[PDB]
Design a protein around this ligand. Structure first.
Ligand SMILES: NS(=O)(=O)c1ccccc1
Ligand SMILES: [Zn+2]
Length: 257
């Protein structure tokens, strides 16, 4: 099965998932000087006040905080998006060291980690149908740098001990994802894909320019998670990021002048 090891990592994925070499793969390097301000972008609206988190799960690749998406509770609208996109889950990608871990890069700079808030287009009824559409998903990406602690992340950090290994889950109700955002909503946007198999080309990426700061201690606890299941040889869950892919026939647009 696919993973992030030398034997099953990003360089191998194309053998099971040929779209890995496709025309709109993610992540990409964001060359800030080539990205162009787009006046046609509408104001971005992140509306998370009624979010209903449910559970946190170690899926053997990362951990997902899952939300109730049976109604328009936490939604993303505006910006490059047509219509309403509902939050279904968030997760992170991170490194073994502070100098790597992000999937997107900014002028080739790698951040320590990257948060993905995953949303599906409500016009398609469910997530499964949405991933059969070129505009099925919107992922809000947020970079993490190591510095001061992020208070809104601590509840996540403290529950990780209970989901150490693949397949473990825990209740995670009443978590407010608003606490994971930076001050500014300035962003870059481009059409791309899921960054893990099945690598489906359904995503409008919205990558915030301002990183959030998290403490060394917070990211260290991410690195104590395990890729393996309980009772199996320990393989630390680190470096669960795909590197930047060819931009090909795409333009990255900026929300800011
Ligand atoms: N990593 S990502 O593109 O946000 C992703 C989201 C949902 C499923 C698989 C991958
Ligand atoms: Zn992701």
């Amino acid at each position: 099965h696919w993973g992030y090891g030398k034997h099953n990592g990003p360089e191998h994925w194309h053998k099971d998932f040929p779209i890995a070499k496709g025309e709109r793969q993610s992540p990409v390097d964001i060359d800030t000087h080539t990205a162009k301000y787009d006046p046609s972008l509408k104001p971005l609206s992140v509306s998370y006040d009624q979010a209903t988190s449910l559970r946190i799960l170690n899926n053997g690749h990362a951990f997902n905080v899952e939300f109730d998406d049976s109604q328009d509770k936490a939604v993303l609208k505006g910006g490059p998006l047509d219509g309403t996109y509902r939050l279904i889950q968030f997760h992170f990608h991170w490194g073994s060291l502070d100098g790597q871990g992000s999937e997107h890069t900014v002028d080739k700079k790698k951040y320590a980690a990257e948060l993905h808030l995953v949303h599906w287009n409500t016009k398609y009824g469910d997530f499964g149908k949405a991933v059969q559409q070129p505009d099925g998903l919107a992922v809000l990406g947020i970079f993490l740098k190591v510095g001061s602690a992020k208070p809104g992340l601590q509840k996540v950090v403290d529950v990780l001990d209970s989901i150490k290994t693949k397949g473990k889950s825990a209740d995670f109700t009443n978590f407010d994802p608003r606490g994971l955002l930076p001050e500014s909503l300035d962003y870059w946007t481009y059409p791309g894909s899921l960054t893990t198999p099945p690598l489906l080309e359904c995503v409008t990426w919205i990558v915030l320019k301002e990183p959030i700061s998290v403490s060394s201690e917070q990211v260290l606890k991410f690195r104590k998670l395990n890729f393996n299941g309980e009772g199996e040889p320990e393989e630390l869950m680190v470096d669960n990021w795909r590197p930047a892919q060819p931009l090909k026939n795409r333009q990255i647009k900026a929300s800011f002048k």
